[PDB]
Q: What sequence folds into this?
């Protein structure tokens, strides 16, 4: 369940 | 709005009366109310004299605390009709004379004064209006008990006594028999202090018991249990 | 119950004066105090009023801004500072006690009053016709009174006060509420009426009842006194 | 115990004084109360709902 | 996986909202005409804060792990993330206030009836709410919508203009939200326990029972407040001052942190309430009867 | 050998009285009023709420104007309220905080107070100084004062725990009349509409009807199993109701000298603290320990209404002379007015 949504929610707009 | 000048003045007078009543209530809510009890010739007068018609009020000032003790002496009537008016006092002081352990209750009816005192204690302790009020027991007249123990054994009123004629263990057994009358030992505390005719530490013990009761009430109402 | 005033005398126009009134014989803290003026033209006029505890204070539209009333409770005294005195200030000032509650009798005690000489509008209007009524003792007297506004409040009460002032004395309260006899007044006097028409009936008149009868309304401030009906012997 | 004798004498005197009281049948003493309660029925604002127009506690 | 985290969050939210509803009903229905004490007002404020936190955080953050895109709009995206933060802040602050109140109500037992009053408690609650509103302003300032380069999806992210401010705000909220209130609560409760040990020395049974009950309650509340918000803050610090690995273990850690942060607010109503004798008495009096 | 003779003579006289009472009971009250239409459901709402007390309110009495009210609590201060505007008209400080009774003079000039001080205080309301002064202090009793009732501005009737009643003169302060004969503490009083007779119930489960101008015990009524705490005369003066701790109220008649009606219920196990009648005498209001009051049908013994809203034991009831509203005071320091 560790998709891009949660990763961006946690790390901000810098997970890409 | 729809009121006249006299009506507005009456409303202002009512507001002033409300302010005065609230001030009086806030001033009276800081005083300690104690209920004084005891059988006849049990030394209650001596206690109220050392610490200093119908119900008597007594005011004490100690360590910035204002105690107000209520002596119900000379009020010979049915207690079941006026005891509920004392629901909410801080503590119940109860005076018991030890020298009454081998004396009749003013009549030769085979009823010892000690048995009547125990009956009164266990009746006022298991009352429905004082299920959480602390009791401060004062055993007076020990200076005479010290000599009465050597002239009359304690087995006159307590046949199951199995000790000697010494003050220490006899007083301990009397205190244990007085404390065993409390059924609800979880929500009620019993303070015991041996008093005499020349004791001056009564007010200090009363102050300590009142502070302990206040601390317990502050622990209870704040939800720390 | 006793009120004594002081501080009068002669004052130059434009100056100031501090009148004092001291009370003795009752709880001064529970009563409201009125300052009333009486000019040499025999006409009464309300000046100032203060309630118990100095909560609410009312002044008249003719004296607002120049006079200041104060109440010292620990000494049971009433002070009145008066600045910028005009030529129309030469008059006699009276202090009146008045409490307000259900069944009370306000304006039940008038002070002695002090004299002050000065060398040189939806207010309800109360009028009293027949300024002179000559009558011998023994017969009945009927004094009529009108008003420009209905004094009958929604609560059923009628704020109408009848006072009597004897020559050389202080005014005395005869009727506090309509059809309600005051304390200390005999049952010979009675009052009735409705709306804006009222009547005062005196039966078995004596010689000691000579004076001027004044009417006052208390429906709303400012309080207005009548022109004064003089009773001639 | 002369005090108890005097108490019993006063008690029996009160009893013999109260025994000689003319009493009426309950069939009439109940009908009287019934008629009294029925006659003053319209004068009871608690029995009949009083309108709010004349009720001073509105 | 979401198939279990969603139902766990739902169960925790249901339990928390039920506890908060029970507490608020017990505190609102019982109106005998007596002035509310400071303790009851603080408990009511805590229950309201926990309700506002649970109603605006769990059912919305569950969508983040359920749906891969934000479909609630910028309005909700900037409303819920501000309101739940304000609720958390005011809950921590009313916790600290209740702790300091229980502190001042023991060391000043004789002066307690004068110090803590209704108007003072109202002013304290108002100042607490004002401070919580004024502290969470950068959250509503920064948090907003974001669109990637594909322009086929929208997210609700922080999007700080500079890391130098985000790290500073994280450190500030970690200091003024976790460390200082916990230290204050621990100090207050340690002083209360010391005062009880120095005063209650009559060697009675009721005294020992009261002391052990107070010690158990203090230990419980301390360990709860210590292990409840620690994972969330430590994960935030690790993500802000380091590299966060994208591993299933990290997902499980984040899920456990969210579960603990929700369990804190769900169990707070059943810790400070339902255990006091007066609260249970009022419940059995006004709810059942 | 005279004590047993007196006892057997007394028991024979009591048996004769019982036989004379039984020989006059033709039918019960429930059979004569069988055709009376029922009242129905009594729905009264609290119109006013008098706040200001900070202790248990024990007494309350209406005046002859049906507008002013008096209240007494454990705070030690009498409060005279205006029921129409809920404004405190007067506040009278008391020397004794334990107050269990209060009375309002029929003229409205004096107020009575009493309690565990065994002294009946009478304060004057209409004073030229505008305050309240201690007008009179009546002493002489050794037990607690349970009730106070004014006959006029010069005479007062009091009851104490000494199993005796007293009639005092206000101008002289001396005990004018003493009523003896009870064995238990008298708990309440009730004046007849003509102020000629009065009933008083004691803790011996018995009431006694006495005459004022004679000082002798006219009649005696029994039937209760517990102590009688309240009593009230009928509006016509030919009946009286008594409430006791046995959760059962009774209504006796004066001319019948028998028990006329009984009100009991299985769901009620709490004692009665106050009993009062309405203006017509059809409804009977009684305060119980179940935190509410019950209004029964005096002619059918059925529960006509329930008045709830108090969080403590109802200590006193009061009905105006015109029957416009009913005041209720309980230990929750709140006064309510149902209409
Ligand atoms: C009254 C106090 C306690 C809180 C006030 C709430 C304010 C600060 C918050 C709550 C939700 C927010 C709104 C949410 C939607 C956006 C849409 C955007 O296009 C302009 C700002 C705007 C309209 C925000 C303005 C500020 C906002 C209204
Ligand atoms: C640094 C963190 C913990 C924020 C600190 C703010 C809170 C915990 C502090 C700041 C000032 C404090 C208030 C000051 C006044 C007292 C009055 C007393 O009768 C009850 C507690 C009360 C009302 C305190 C409650 C807690 C309090 C509001
Ligand atoms: C003083 C406290 C109580 C509340 C402070 C209000 C602040 C936090 C809120 C209220 C409305 C918000 C503004 C609404 C419009 C947006 C436009 C966007 O392009 C930049 C941020 C900006 C300009 C927001 C900045 C923050 C904002 C000003
Ligand atoms: C209340 C106390 C603890 C607050 C402490 C302030 C700290 C957390 C804040 C205030 C301003 C911040 C600095 C601002 C400039 C950036 C430059 C960047 O290249 C590294 C981090 C760094 C150097 C920040 C580090 C953290 C920082 C120092
Ligand atoms: C929340 C945390 C900090 C609570 C910690 C519990 C502390 C405050 C309590 C629990 C039991 C207490 C100890 C009990 C007995 C010792 C030795 C004695 O001779 C003096 C008191 C002293 C030194 C007490 C110190 C404080 C104490 C340790």
A:
């Amino acid at each position: 369940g560790w998709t891009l949504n949660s990763a961006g929610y946690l790390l901000g707009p810098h997970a890409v | 709005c729809t009121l006249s000048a006299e009506d507005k003045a009456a409303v202002e007078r009512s507001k002033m009366i409300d302010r005065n009543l609230r001030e009086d209530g806030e001033k009276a809510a800081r005083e300690v109310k104690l209920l004084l009890l005891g059988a006849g010739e049990s030394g209650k007068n001596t206690i109220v004299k050392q610490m200093k018609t119908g119900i008597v009020e007594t005011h004490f000032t100690f360590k910035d605390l204002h105690f107000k003790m209520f002596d119900v002496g000379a009020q010979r009537s049915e207690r079941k009709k006026w005891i509920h008016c004392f629901e909410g006092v801080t503590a119940i002081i109860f005076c018991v004379a030890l020298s009454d352990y081998d004396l009749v209750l003013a009549e030769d009816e085979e009823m010892n004064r000690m048995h009547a005192s125990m009956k009164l204690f266990d009746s006022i302790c298991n009352n429905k209006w004082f299920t959480d009020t602390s009791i401060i027991l004062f055993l007076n007249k020990k200076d005479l008990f010290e000599e009465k123990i050597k002239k009359s054994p304690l087995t006159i009123c307590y046949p199951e006594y199995a000790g000697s004629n010494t003050y220490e263990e006899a007083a301990a057994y009397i205190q244990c028999q007085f404390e065993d009358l409390n059924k609800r030992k979880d929500t009620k505390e019993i303070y015991t202090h041996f008093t005499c005719s020349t004791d001056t530490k009564n007010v200090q013990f009363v102050f300590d018991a009142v502070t302990d009761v206040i601390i317990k009430n502050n622990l209870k109402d704040c939800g720390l249990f | 119950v006793q009120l004594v005033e002081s501080g009068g005398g002669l004052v130059q126009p434009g100056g100031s004066r501090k009148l004092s009134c001291s009370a003795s014989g009752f709880a001064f803290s529970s009563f409201g105090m009125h300052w009333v003026r009486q000019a040499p033209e025999k006409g009464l006029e309300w000046v100032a009023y203060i309630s118990s505890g100095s909560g609410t204070i009312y002044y008249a539209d003719t004296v607002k801004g120049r006079f200041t009333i104060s109440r010292d409770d620990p000494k049971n005294t009433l002070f009145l500072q008066m600045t910028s005195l005009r030529s129309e200030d030469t008059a006699m000032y009276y202090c009146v006690r008045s409490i307000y509650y259900y069944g009370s009798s306000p304006f039940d005690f008038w002070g002695q009053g002090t004299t002050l000489t000065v060398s040189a509008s939806a207010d309800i209007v109360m009028t009293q016709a027949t300024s002179s009524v000559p009558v011998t003792p023994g017969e009945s007297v009927s004094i009529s009174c009108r008003s420009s506004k209905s004094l009958l409040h929604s609560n059923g009460n009628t704020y109408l006060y009848w006072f009597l002032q004897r020559p050389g004395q202080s005014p005395q309260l005869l009727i506090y509420r309509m059809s309600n006899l005051a304390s200390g007044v005999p049952d010979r006097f009675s009052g009735s009426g409705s709306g804006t028409a009222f009547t005062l009936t005196i039966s078995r008149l004596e010689a000691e009842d000579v004076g001027v009868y004044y009417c006052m309304q208390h429906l709303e401030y400012p309080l207005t006194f009548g022109a004064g009906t003089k009773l001639e012997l | 115990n002369t005090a108890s004798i005097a108490q019993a004498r006063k008690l029996v005197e009160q009893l013999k004084m109260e025994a000689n009281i003319d009493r009426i049948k309950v069939s009439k003493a109940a009908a009287d109360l019934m008629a009294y309660c029925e006659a003053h029925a319209k004068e009871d604002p608690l029995l009949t709902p009083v309108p709010a127009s004349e009720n001073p506690f509105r | 996986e979401n198939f279990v985290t969603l139902v766990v969050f739902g169960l925790i939210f249901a339990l928390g909202v039920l506890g908060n509803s029970l507490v608020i009903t017990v505190l609102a229905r019982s109106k005998p005409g007596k002035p509310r004490s400071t303790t009851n007002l603080f408990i009511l404020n805590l229950s309201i804060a926990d309700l506002a936190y649970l109603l605006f955080c769990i059912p919305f953050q569950a969508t983040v792990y359920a749906l891969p895109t934000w479909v609630l709009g910028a309005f909700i995206c900037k409303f819920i993330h501000y309101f739940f933060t304000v609720s958390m802040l005011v809950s921590i602050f009313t916790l600290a206030a209740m702790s300091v109140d229980r502190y001042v109500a023991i060391v000043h037992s004789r002066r307690s009836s004068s110090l803590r009053v209704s108007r003072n408690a109202l002013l304290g609650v108002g100042c607490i709410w004002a401070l919580s509103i004024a502290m969470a302003s950068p959250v509503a300032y920064h948090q907003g919508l974001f669109h990637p380069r594909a322009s086929n999806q929208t997210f609700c992210w922080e999007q700080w203009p500079d890391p130098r401010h985000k790290k500073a705000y994280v450190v500030c909220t970690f200091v003024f939200g976790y460390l200082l209130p916990l230290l204050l609560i621990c100090f207050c409760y340690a002083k209360v326990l010391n005062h009880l040990h120095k005063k209650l020395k009559n060697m009675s049974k009721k005294s020992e029972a009261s002391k052990k009950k107070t010690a158990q309650t203090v230990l419980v509340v301390v360990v709860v407040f210590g292990i409840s918000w620690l994972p969330h803050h430590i994960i935030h610090l690790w993500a802000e001052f380091g590299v966060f690995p994208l591993t299933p273990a990290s997902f499980l850690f984040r899920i456990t942190a969210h579960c603990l942060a929700y369990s804190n607010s769900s169990v707070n109503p059943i810790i400070y309430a339902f255990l006091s004798e007066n609260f249970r008495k009022a419940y059995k009096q006004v709810f059942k009867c | 050998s005279e004590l047993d003779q007196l006892r057997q003579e007394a028991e024979q006289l009591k048996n004769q009285i019982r036989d004379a009472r039984k020989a006059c009971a033709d039918a019960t009250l429930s059979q004569i009023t069988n055709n009376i239409d029922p009242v129905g459901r009594i729905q009264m709402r609290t119109r006013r709420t008098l706040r200001g007390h900070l202790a248990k309110i024990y007494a309350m009495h209406w005046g002859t104007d049906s507008r002013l009210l008096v209240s007494a609590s454990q705070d030690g201060k009498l409060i005279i309220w205006d029921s129409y505007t809920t404004n405190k008209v007067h506040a009278i400080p008391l020397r004794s905080s334990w107050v269990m009774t209060c009375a309002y003079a029929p003229s409205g000039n004096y107020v009575a107070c009493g309690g565990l001080d065994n002294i009946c205080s009478i304060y004057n309301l209409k004073t030229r100084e505008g305050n309240v002064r201690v007008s009179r202090e009546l002493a002489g009793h050794t037990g607690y004062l349970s009730c106070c009732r004014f006959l006029d501005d010069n005479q007062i009737v009091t009851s104490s725990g000494d199993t005796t009643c007293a009639l005092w003169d206000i101008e002289t302060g001396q005990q004018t009349t003493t009523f003896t004969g009870h064995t238990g503490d008298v708990m309440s009083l009730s004046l007849a509409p003509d102020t000629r007779l009065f009933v008083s119930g004691a803790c011996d489960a018995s009431a006694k009807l006495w005459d004022v101008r004679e000082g002798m015990c006219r009649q005696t009524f029994t039937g209760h199993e517990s102590d009688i705490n309240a009593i009230c005369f009928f509006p016509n003066g030919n009946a009286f109701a008594t409430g006791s701790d046995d959760a059962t109220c009774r209504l006796f008649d004066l001319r019948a000298d028998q028990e006329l009606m009984t009100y009991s219920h299985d769901n009620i196990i709490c004692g009665i603290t106050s009993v009062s009648f309405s203006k017509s005498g059809r409804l009977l209001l009684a305060g119980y320990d179940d935190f509410n009051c019950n209004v029964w049908d005096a002619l059918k013994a059925d529960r006509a209404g329930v008045l709830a809203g108090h969080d403590n034991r109802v200590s006193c009831l009061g009905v105006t002379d015109d029957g416009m509203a009913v005041a209720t005071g309980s230990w929750d320091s709140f006064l309510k007015i149902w209409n």
User: Anything to note?
Assistant: Chains E and D do not touch (no CB pair under 8 Å).
